[PDB]
Design an enzyme around this catalytic site. Sequence first.
Site, mmCIF file in Angstrom:
data_model
loop_
_atom_site.group_PDB
_atom_site.id
_atom_site.type_symbol
_atom_site.label_atom_id
_atom_site.label_comp_id
_atom_site.label_asym_id
_atom_site.label_seq_id
_atom_site.Cartn_x
_atom_site.Cartn_y
_atom_site.Cartn_z
ATOM 1 N N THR A 16 0.802 -1.927 0.128
ATOM 2 C CA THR A 16 -0.159 -0.320 -0.135
ATOM 3 C C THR A 16 0.498 1.290 0.378
ATOM 4 O O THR A 16 0.499 2.004 -0.148
ATOM 5 C CB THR A 16 -0.817 0.084 1.034
ATOM 6 O OG1 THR A 16 0.126 0.009 2.415
ATOM 7 C CG2 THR A 16 -1.658 -1.144 1.251
ATOM 8 N N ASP A 39 4.185 -7.372 -29.636
ATOM 9 C CA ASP A 39 5.264 -7.073 -29.563
ATOM 10 C C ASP A 39 6.722 -7.253 -30.682
ATOM 11 O O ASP A 39 6.220 -7.383 -31.960
ATOM 12 C CB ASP A 39 6.488 -6.865 -28.134
ATOM 13 C CG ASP A 39 6.464 -5.618 -27.579
ATOM 14 O OD1 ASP A 39 7.784 -5.236 -28.236
ATOM 15 O OD2 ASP A 39 6.394 -5.267 -26.524
ATOM 16 N N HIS A 69 12.951 -5.635 -26.764
ATOM 17 C CA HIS A 69 11.731 -4.554 -25.854
ATOM 18 C C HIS A 69 10.624 -5.806 -25.746
ATOM 19 O O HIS A 69 9.956 -5.734 -25.151
ATOM 20 C CB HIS A 69 11.017 -3.712 -26.956
ATOM 21 C CG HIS A 69 9.535 -3.067 -26.326
ATOM 22 N ND1 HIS A 69 8.661 -3.107 -26.973
ATOM 23 C CD2 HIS A 69 10.280 -1.739 -25.649
ATOM 24 C CE1 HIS A 69 7.802 -2.427 -26.499
ATOM 25 N NE2 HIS A 69 8.717 -1.430 -25.944
ATOM 26 N N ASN A 161 4.592 7.561 -24.692
ATOM 27 C CA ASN A 161 5.120 8.767 -24.300
ATOM 28 C C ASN A 161 5.873 10.140 -24.217
ATOM 29 O O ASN A 161 6.625 10.063 -24.304
ATOM 30 C CB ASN A 161 6.744 7.565 -23.613
ATOM 31 C CG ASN A 161 6.415 6.265 -23.076
ATOM 32 O OD1 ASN A 161 6.012 5.614 -22.351
ATOM 33 N ND2 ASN A 161 7.085 5.298 -24.195
ATOM 34 N N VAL A 177 -10.617 -0.723 -23.999
ATOM 35 C CA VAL A 177 -10.057 -1.138 -23.268
ATOM 36 C C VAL A 177 -9.184 -1.242 -21.831
ATOM 37 O O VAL A 177 -9.728 -0.221 -21.738
ATOM 38 C CB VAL A 177 -8.587 -2.002 -23.885
ATOM 39 C CG1 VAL A 177 -9.725 -2.706 -25.687
ATOM 40 C CG2 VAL A 177 -7.690 -0.433 -24.342
ATOM 41 N N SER A 224 5.062 1.740 -22.227
ATOM 42 C CA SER A 224 5.373 -0.263 -22.320
ATOM 43 C C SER A 224 5.139 -0.905 -21.066
ATOM 44 O O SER A 224 5.736 -2.018 -21.052
ATOM 45 C CB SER A 224 6.742 -0.054 -23.681
ATOM 46 O OG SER A 224 5.868 0.135 -24.816
#
Length: 279
Positions: A16, A39, A69, A161, A177, A224
């Site tokens: 928490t 990906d 990645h 980003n 989504v 990502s």
Amino acid sequence: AAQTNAPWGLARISSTSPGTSTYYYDESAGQGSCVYVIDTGIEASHPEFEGRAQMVKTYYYSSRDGNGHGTHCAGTVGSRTYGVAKKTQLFGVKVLDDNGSGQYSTIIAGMDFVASDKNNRNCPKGVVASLSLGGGYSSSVNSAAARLQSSGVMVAVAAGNNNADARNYSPASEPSVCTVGASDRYDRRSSFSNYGSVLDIFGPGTDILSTWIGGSTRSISGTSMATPHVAGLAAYLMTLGKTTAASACRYIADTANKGDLSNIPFGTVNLLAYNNYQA
Ligand SMILES: [Ca+2]
Ligand SMILES: [Ca+2]
């Protein structure tokens, strides 16, 4: 179960408060669930995947991750040391080339592929898809993400980003989504993370250690990296029977740490993914 000296992001989603170093989780660890990582591919031979990863589809000459990645993201979902759901099954779909780039038509095909392919797999606890990619707004890309979700797959996508409103990016801006922003280890919004009303949830995204190609590891940053934390958490929660693919994003938001983050613009949720584990 407890993993000591865990990567900070794993510790964070089982606490928490920030600043802890142990990842607490139920031993079931996502067993019986499946996560598609859409990906650059997955280095399935990496020891950290323990034989639980496989490539199922590529849209290029090879199925090999020549970038890193995809392997990094897959590791945060389900590698032994760096993963949220340490016993899940990982399926790689290579829609991005080895430079980390891909056409929208290929990304769409990859989503439609997962919606069909899941019907040929044994995933009794359910199916998740993790999409750490995106670009400018496209209604066709959004529609493909919506289809995948509608087909019974929990879809998690990166917010992007650009330090901007995610409404102008896809598939981030598809409402149906689960759109994921990034935070850092001091509970600040990551400086690069997109924001906005379409975000559903934040996950750890700055300085995330995970698997890399060549059987290695490295730390990198981005929305990502936050997205597979949430994808792994969904698989973990579905295995426990707490939620389903249709409602996992909502359940994660409902049970999140609330109000812990700083530098959140008015209108953006202040919710941080949390597994609510109690021994
Ligand atoms: Ca707190
Ligand atoms: Ca949403």
